[PDB]
Design a protein around this ligand. Structure first.
Ligand SMILES: Nc1ncnc2c1ncn2[C@@H]1O[C@H](COP(=O)(O)OP(=O)(O)O)[C@@H](O)[C@H]1O
Ligand SMILES: Nc1ncnc2c1ncn2[C@@H]1O[C@H](COP(=O)(O)OP(=O)(O)O)[C@@H](O)[C@H]1O
Ligand SMILES: Nc1ncnc2c1ncn2[C@@H]1O[C@H](COP(=O)(O)OP(=O)(O)O)[C@@H](O)[C@H]1O
Ligand code: BEF
Ligand code: BEF
Ligand code: BEF
Ligand SMILES: [Mg+2]
Ligand SMILES: [Mg+2]
Ligand SMILES: [Mg+2]
Ligand SMILES: [Zn+2]
Lengths: 635, 683, 633
């Protein structure tokens, strides 16, 4: 039966939608995209929309408060309003659903603070996904065919979790036979099945109370929201905190509670599998294109990687090339050629190697940080968990770092057995299980960066590098660039270091006082003012802001796919032959991996310059980096 | 009709049924109509499978559309609601079933004689009722319907023996054509005909599944059949037939396994490939219910495109997690296409004969096939020849006494880092139809254990096979051999020699059968080879293990201004164009490789007196030479009786490559050349 | 829950309605009439339409057979289609209901033949209404008001009768409190009520077997169908023969069976309460006016009444005037003046007095026939039931605005005539008995027949001894005729040829020896002008249904008024009738003056004249003189 208050709320929400034409434009974009993809074939984009709760609160405080604290009565009117708006807009010949973003005030919670006095309210819980039930479709309407009468019959189905309002519980039995008594045959493919997935969100360990058992809450995701995340992610699941069941009051201890999902936001956090994408405005793309024209673009970018750290410019250039990466090559026969470059730093203590690793973790889109032995060989790669609910596979560090970076620290302390398992991931970029009857080849296309002090604490010039490094020759071969750094007591260099350090420690953030302690920011970025930074610890180049550098890397990796040229090929071949057939007691062994890393470094430099082809200058720069790494020559 | 409304659906089933009957009767462009001929074959009990090709249906639709007659998209309708069309097609087959041209003999199987008895009994019942009603004295045109109404006969489903399967429309015709990953099998595709592409991990044993269970009630002499359409069911207590339910007589009914209907059933499990898995996820699996004559067409480790019907099943998990009519899903297999054809399934059909002789006429098949494998790798040609010999394999000998010789080659690829050993192994994995890429340590520890576990489907305590068993009649492609635990090397000993794994641990007292050819890539002791140390001290293999390797390459990296730039130019060309540099060379496609190698495997060449005399002289000189410098800096151990046997195996496989069915001196000369040049890279 | 079969039936009926545009035009007329009625205020026709089932059978046999056999699945789709048509037509910013006319084949039954095999089938039953329940409102929607919130809540009710298809039984609970526990105040005047009435139809006495108990069926009427019948009417109710209730199948002898009402037709019959209205086409109106322009229109019409009856021309003219009737005067202060003409026929046996009465019974718009001793003063006037103490309308009350034909007036008891006095003169029936003080209204004109007291009218004695009636009663009768069967060879001969010609009359399509079959002639209440066969063999004789049409048109349309020329003629005639002695068959009172005025008005009606002229007064005076003096010019 029609309700007047329902229609009033529908009208109010239609007025809100007409007020903020952004949502109407977004709906039109959805519909035109679906129609175009239908016409192209003679990915359908889902029937959903995002509502800025701040905009709604500005428009109508009553409606905003109603959705926030009385969602079961306010959301369905708004969804119906959206559906009517879509139907009216779709002049071209399954209701739409809402999604919410904005500030939820006191309702922004975590699975520990999710108490009963938030029930039946729209909440925005944040945590780490720990379990994801496999997507099991749900039967909402079953179509049957009657052989005798030759007509199709249907019945609709529903449950408690489908509807925000409590529809009158009606038993849902399956129509075995028709009213006249004829036999009925189920018609799959005409019946409508909808997806359904139960995921469990646990409080994030980054803010969970240490030493106490965790708290978990179940989330029921349906339709477009299924398979949105995987275990080990960080999510911001906003939805209605429904409470279900009889609570045991019916004569058969508490009420079962769960969150009906409206929106799922995978959140980027350091050393997590969720990649950190960023929005590129036309202004940002224009700035990137203009800045790529400069001849000193490589130097300008490289200086910006670690402004805090003095010197190590070649290491910074190598790190930037790693962030850009190379192009992996796949051939018809099935062979896969590595397109990722690995960097190893070996040097004296307090040489800022761990600082560089931490920055790489803090600036890459997808980076995973591990220590020496805390992440064992089982911790790296992957291994079977032998879960009783059977023989599941759990992805270790490197599998979770696919298309990303792994920042291994204290590589020297690693167990020999642990470093045995790393060879295949380094070179073939795959992890083969072949264990317990499970034969699987996980994809691990990760770039590895490691820091490790020499065995004798400080690098020994008197001893040969083979004695100091003590790493297996194969492992050193797999590492593209093997930097051997030292803490050399030089008056000018050391006093410059002191100048830089004291300049860095004398920094006051703009929104701060003198004695005001700096407040830690978790900075859980969500996976979805000038270019240059005025502050500079090192003085006169132009240093770019770290977020702008992230935008530049994100643009360059996707847009540009460089290809080699004969001119660059000749230079690469000459450098490779000269390295192989000249003996200058190089730090690393010289093999075909050196040729491969020359190619990859040239490709990375080409990507930095946003060039569709690899040129001579890229080859020269790559050769210079390699010679600096091995011989130490610097021009 | 308030409870059950109705829908106006575009599809009509009677017109489609008539179209199906017409297509069955009058399709002959592929000695009469193709499917009528197949039905005639099935009637004679020669064939128990009917495969309806959707490509034939599309061709029939198109040809009827050119002439002018409008034909509904029967192929599209099958692609949308395939399950109902199976019933439509089986009814059409029953309506057009030809009369058998040969009667029932004693050699025929039990199901055929039971079905013939049922058909004869149905005809006798119908004729008896017609005779009675004719004698009642009340034209057969009217009488037939009356008799059919008043008769109680054997239904068509229990009187048919053929199994019916579809075949997806081929991709070359331009939704069933497109192979889908497991992740892309959403709830939208339920009920359709889809093709899933992925690896097969677990296949259950063939067990009898009840379709209809037959009970016998001797009190009223009626056979009552209860259909079973779930994982479980319930037997009966009172004869539900007309008399026992109607009369005061209450007949006890008993099951009859022979009279009941069964079907060969197998709950396979396909898995997502590494290419299909997105960035950062792990592969997920989908269950396959293989039924009927299609059983034993899927084995673990196979890479297949199974086409089937994505049907739902009632939820089977815990009831608390249930929220609404949740459905578990499976895929009822219809057609199986193997990406890599098995060696044991080679028939020299005229077409395979022509592709093969075209390869023969190319000339120099040995060298062309050797250079063909992994063209992106330059300058390592002897190793490619050795790997080709590994693929071909020698000849197993089982003398009348009981001695069995291995007949397979075990190649090793010891060498310096960065000489593309792992890429050769991966290439061999690509060409080889069956083979595990076992690598490293720790993972191998349980991949060779082969312990015992309970199968969910049948509750059988099936043993699980490790990597080596899964690689039966394949290539084990063990990588990083030197860095792998000694415990597994102990088993590798017996696998290489006896081709079997003997296990006598707690709970298991059997001897597994693992006929495998092992390919091993490893680095020498202290990583890079040190020329100062002796090869045996640097290879680090014990004399027992090294004896089992027929060929042990050295693949030492020795820089040179010429070969280095050759390799550099080759690699740069490979990077700048995704193709091997050689313009004039023709790298054979892997399918043709497999086909020729499979033809070669069928041939089993024998030896000639001159050949074995030359081999005996070679063995004598090798033994004496090995003894002479067994204590030198260029020693390679001491030749063993196996060393000749290896020579024999390489010569036999080389003969197989020429398909000579008899070994000549040139084969032995080439084999000795390979064995000698396997160690000439250290100079 | 939209359904495909329902939608297809709906679109099929919409196609049917589009095919036969007459129903569309009628719906448009209803809509524009209602809009115009609302316009005058800055009656309401019901949202119903009559469907000819014959046209539906012609257009779509399947849908027709579906309506007749299983109306539950077919009537609601048709009503939805009609509602959609009405909404679409009503572009100007309560569903429509459907009604049926036409042939019902084997489903046209009587309450005796409503066997259970006809259940759930559209039946057309005919019978007499015995009991009618009071028209009670039925609650279907109840609007409530929450005092705190200020929002109006509503609920919709239903029951098995109000819908054809069986709905899921939802108990009717009156909302006393809001969903949040707030008190609710019921809002009468905003809630919707539907009139509901149950009537019982019994087998028609004319067709019922004699000496056996009657059989009856119950009819449930709703909304606009309520109070469309009076007890004792003859009706043709058509509707679904639904069966209701568990019928004892559920543990506590058959099923409650009743005819849900779709349409009710008051069937006119001989000597019943329902009048007979004849549809006046424009062709009929033009013919009526043209014939009215004729000179001897009065003679033509009067001779057309009883052609099979020879002579009695003056009696026929009097009967024609009585059928036409005079105008009724209700003065402003409140007084009442009778405007009807009563006729009394006293004569010898076999002078045709009864046949004329039977003709009047068969041809008047509303006539009731009674005999003298059989029908008492309780039969006339009205009676009290004493069952609580309800009034049973008698003969004279039922015949309001009609004619009462009393036979054997001489035989009827003196008490009965004492009762009939007031009805004949004051045209009211007063009860004032047993605590029931009401004045029933009976404005009827009486025609009667009586034999003379001595068996035959012996002219030797005075008229008083032959008539043997009270003087006041004779004063009530406007025209008193005495007819004597006197022997005359010429008259006897002419009568003989006339009667013989009547006896050798052949129907248009009957064989010479075929027996003629009677028919009940149950006309439905809402070919040429003249008649081919004239038994008296030139003055044209009009066709008797055309005469009924003429009488109806004259009675409805024309209301004459007196004029000075007439006044003078009537005054002089009354004066010289009163003051001259000629041994009149009746005494002269002011009632004779009223009779002269009434006959003049009736004659003016016959000519379709808005005024009374001298000729009408002359005709009235001559007719009254023939009545009293027994002589004419
Ligand atoms: N070249 C440098 N420029 C700036 N700070 C430096 C430099 N070298 C070392 N430091 C500082 O010294 C400390 C040690 O750096 P860390 O990365 O922990 O050293 P290690 O190489 O032992 O891991 C840090 O606080 C870092 O900021
Ligand atoms: N002869 C060669 N031809 C082609 N590529 C080679 C060759 N030698 C080395 N490479 C390259 O060097 C790298 C070493 O590959 P891989 O097979 O892992 O080496 P290994 O297992 O011998 O240590 C790969 O990028 C490979 O393409
Ligand atoms: N003048 C007449 N013209 C024709 N028929 C007449 C005439 N007089 C009598 N009859 C016939 O004589 C019969 C007696 O008429 P009826 O009305 O019954 O007489 P009564 O006056 O005794 O009631 C009827 O059949 C009627 O048709
Ligand atoms: F002292 Be450091 F962390 F190498
Ligand atoms: F360095 Be390689 F994998 F032998
Ligand atoms: F003989 Be009658 F009916 F006056
Ligand atoms: Mg450190
Ligand atoms: Mg390797
Ligand atoms: Mg009489
Ligand atoms: Zn029995």
């Amino acid at each position: 039966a029609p309700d007047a208050v329902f229609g009033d709320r529908v009208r109010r929400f239609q007025e809100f939608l007409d007020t903020f034409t952004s949502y109407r434009d977004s709906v039109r974009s959805i519909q035109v995209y679906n129609s175009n993809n239908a016409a192209n074939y003679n990915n359908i984009l889902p029937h959903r929309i995002i509502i800025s709760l701040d905009d709604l609160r500005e428009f109508d405080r009553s409606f905003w408060s109603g959705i926030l604290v009385e969602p079961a009565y306010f959301i369905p009117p708004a969804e119906k309003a959206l559906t009517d708006l879509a139907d009216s807009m779709d002049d071209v010949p399954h209701p739409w659903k809402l999604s919410f973003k904005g500030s939820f005030g006191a309702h922004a919670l975590s699975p520990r603070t999710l108490t009963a006095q938030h029930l039946n309210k729209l909440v925005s819980v944040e945590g780490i996904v720990t379990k994801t039930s496999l997507v099991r479709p749900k039967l909402i309407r079953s179509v049957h065919y009657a052989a005798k009468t030759g007509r199709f019959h249907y019945r609709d189905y529903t449950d408690a979790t489908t509807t925000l309002t409590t529809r009158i519980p009606t038993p849902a039995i399956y129509p075995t036979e028709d009213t006249e008594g004829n036999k009925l045959t189920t018609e799959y493919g005409y019946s409508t099945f909808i997806d359904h997935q139960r995921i469990t969100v646990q409080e994030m360990p980054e803010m969970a109370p240490a030493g106490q058992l965790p708290r978990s809450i179940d989330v029921i995701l349906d339709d477009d929201l299924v398979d949105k995340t995987k275990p080990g992610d960080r999510v911001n699941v906003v939805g209605v905190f429904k409470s279900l069941g009889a609570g045991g009051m019916n004569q058969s201890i508490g009420f079962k509670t769960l969150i009906l999902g409206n929106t799922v936001y995978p959140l980027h956090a350091r050393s997590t599998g969720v990649a950190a994408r960023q929005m590129l405005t036309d202004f940002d793309i224009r700035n990137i294109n203009k800045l790529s024209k400069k001849k000193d673009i490589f130097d300008i970018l490289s200086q910006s990687l670690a402004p805090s750290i003095y010197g190590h410019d070649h290491i910074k250039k190598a790190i930037l090339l790693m962030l850009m990466g190379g192009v992996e090559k796949n051939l018809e026969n099935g062979s896969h050629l590595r397109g990722d470059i690995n960097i190893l730093m070996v040097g004296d203590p307090s040489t800022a190697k761990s600082q560089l690793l931490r920055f790489v973790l803090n600036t890459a889109s997808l980076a995973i940080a591990t220590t020496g032995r805390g992440s064992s060989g089982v911790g790296l790669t992957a291994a079977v968990t032998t879960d009783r609910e059977e023989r599941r596979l759990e992805a270790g560090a490197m599998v979770l770092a696919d298309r990303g970076v792994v920042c291994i620290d204290e590589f020297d302390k690693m167990t020999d057995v642990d470093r045995v398992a790393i060879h295949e991931v380094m070179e073939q970029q795959t992890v083969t299980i072949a264990k317990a009857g499970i034969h699987t080849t996980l994809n691990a296309r990760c770039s590895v960066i490691a820091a490790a002090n020499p065995v004798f604490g400080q690098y020994d010039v008197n001893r040969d590098p083979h004695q100091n490094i003590a790493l297996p020759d194969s492992l050193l071969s797999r590492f593209d660039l093997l930097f051997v750094v030292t803490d050399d007591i030089n008056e000018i260099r050391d006093r410059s270091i002191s100048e830089h350090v004291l300049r860095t420690h004398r920094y006051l953030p703009p929104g701060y006082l003198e004695g005001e302690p700096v407040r830690e920011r978790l900075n859980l970025s969500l996976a979805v003012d000038h270019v240059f930074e005025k502050f500079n610890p090192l003085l006169i180049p132009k240093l770019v802001t770290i977020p702008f550098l992230r935008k530049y890397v994100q643009y360059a990796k996707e847009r540009v796919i460089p290809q080699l040229t004969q001119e660059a090929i000749n230079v690469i071949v000459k450098n490779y032959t000269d390295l192989r057939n000249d003996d200058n007691t190089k730090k690393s062994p010289i093999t075909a991996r050196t040729l491969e890393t020359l190619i990859r470094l040239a490709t990375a430099h080409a990507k930095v310059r946003l060039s569709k082809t690899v040129n001579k200058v890229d080859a020269k720069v790559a050769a210079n980096l390699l010679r600096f790494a091995l011989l130490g020559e610097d021009i | 009709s308030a409870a059950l409304p109705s829908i106006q659906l575009p599809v009509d089933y009677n017109n489609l049924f008539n179209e199906i009957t017409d297509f069955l009767v009058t399709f002959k462009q592929d000695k009469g109509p193709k499917y009528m001929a197949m039905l005639q074959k099935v009637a004679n009990r020669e064939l128990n499978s009917v495969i309806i090709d959707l490509d034939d249906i599309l061709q029939y639709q198109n040809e009827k559309f050119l002439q002018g007659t409008q034909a509904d998209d029967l192929v599209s309708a099958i692609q949308q609601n395939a399950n109902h069309f199976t019933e439509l097609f089986c009814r059409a087959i029953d309506n057009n079933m030809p009369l058998p041209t040969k009667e029932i003999d004693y050699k025929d199987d039990v199901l055929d004689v039971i079905l013939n008895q049922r058909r004869l009994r149905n005809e006798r019942m119908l004729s008896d009722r017609t005779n009675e009603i004719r004698s009642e004295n009340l034209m057969n045109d009217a009488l037939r319907e009356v008799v059919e109404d008043e008769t109680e006969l054997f239904p068509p489903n229990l009187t048919r023996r053929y199994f019916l399967y579809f075949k997806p429309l081929s991709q070359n015709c331009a939704i069933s054509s497109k192979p889908l990953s497991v992740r892309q099998i959403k709830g939208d595709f339920l009920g359709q005909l889809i093709t899933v592409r992925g690896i097969i991990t677990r296949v259950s044993d063939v067990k009898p599944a009840v379709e209809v269970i037959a009970y016998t009630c001797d009190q009223c002499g009626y056979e009552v059949f209860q259909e079973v359409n779930s994982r479980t069911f319930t037997p009966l207590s009172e004869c539900t037939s007309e008399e026992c339910s109607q009369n005061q007589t209450k007949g006890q009914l008993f099951m009859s396994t022979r009279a009941s209907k069964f079907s060969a059933f197998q709950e396979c499990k396909i898995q997502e490939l590494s290419q299909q898995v997105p960035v950062g996820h792990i592969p997920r699996s989908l269950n396959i219910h293989v039924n009927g004559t299609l059983v034993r067409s899927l084995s673990p480790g196979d890479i297949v495109d199974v086409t089937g019907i994505f049907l739902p099943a009632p939820y089977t998990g815990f009831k608390a997690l249930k929220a609404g009519l949740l459905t578990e899903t499976y895929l009822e297999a219809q057609f199986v296409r193997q990406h890599k054809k098995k060696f044991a399934s080679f028939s020299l059909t005229s077409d395979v004969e022509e592709r093969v002789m075209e390869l023969i006429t190319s000339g120099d098949v040995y060298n062309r096939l050797a250079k063909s494998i992994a063209p992106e790798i330059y300058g390592n040609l002897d190793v490619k020849k050795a790997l080709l010999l590994l693929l071909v394999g020698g000849v197993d000998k089982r003398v009348g006494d009981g001695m069995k010789i291995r007949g397979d080659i075990n190649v090793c690829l010891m060498g310096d880092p960065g000489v593309a050993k792992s890429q050769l192994l991966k290439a061999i994995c690509k060409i080889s139809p069956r083979g595990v890429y076992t690598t490293g340590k720790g993972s191998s520890g349980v991949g060779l254990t082969a312990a015992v576990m309970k199968d969910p489907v049948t509750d059988e305590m099936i043993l699980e096979g490790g990597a080596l068993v899964l690689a039966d009649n394949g290539i084990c492609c063990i990588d990083e051999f030197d860095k792998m635990d000694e415990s597994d090397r102990t088993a590798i000993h017996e696998v290489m020699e006896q081709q079997t794994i003997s296990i006598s641990k707690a709970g298991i007292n059997t001897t597994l059968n693992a006929r495998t050819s092992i390919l091993a890539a490893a680095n020498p002791l202290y990583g890079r080879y040190n020329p100062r140390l002796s090869p045996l001290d640097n290879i680090n293999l014990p004399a027992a293990l090294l004896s089992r390797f027929d060929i042990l390459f050295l693949m030492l990296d020795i820089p040179s201004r010429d070969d280095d730039e050759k390799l550099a130019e080759h690699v740069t060309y490979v990077h700048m164009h995704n193709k091997q540099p050689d313009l004039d060379f023709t790298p054979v496609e892997p399918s043709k490789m497999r086909e020729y190698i499979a033809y070669a495997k069928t041939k089993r060449p024998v030896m000639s007196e001159a050949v074995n005399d030359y081999v005996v002289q070679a063995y004598i000189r090798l033994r004496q030479d090995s003894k002479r410098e067994m204590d030198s800096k260029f020693s390679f151990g001491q030749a063993t009786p196996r060393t000749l046997l290896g020579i024999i195996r390489l010569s036999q496989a080389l003969a197989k490559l020429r398909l000579a069915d008899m070994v000549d001196i040139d084969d032995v000369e080439e084999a000795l050349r390979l064995v000698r040049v396997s160690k000439e890279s250290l100079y």
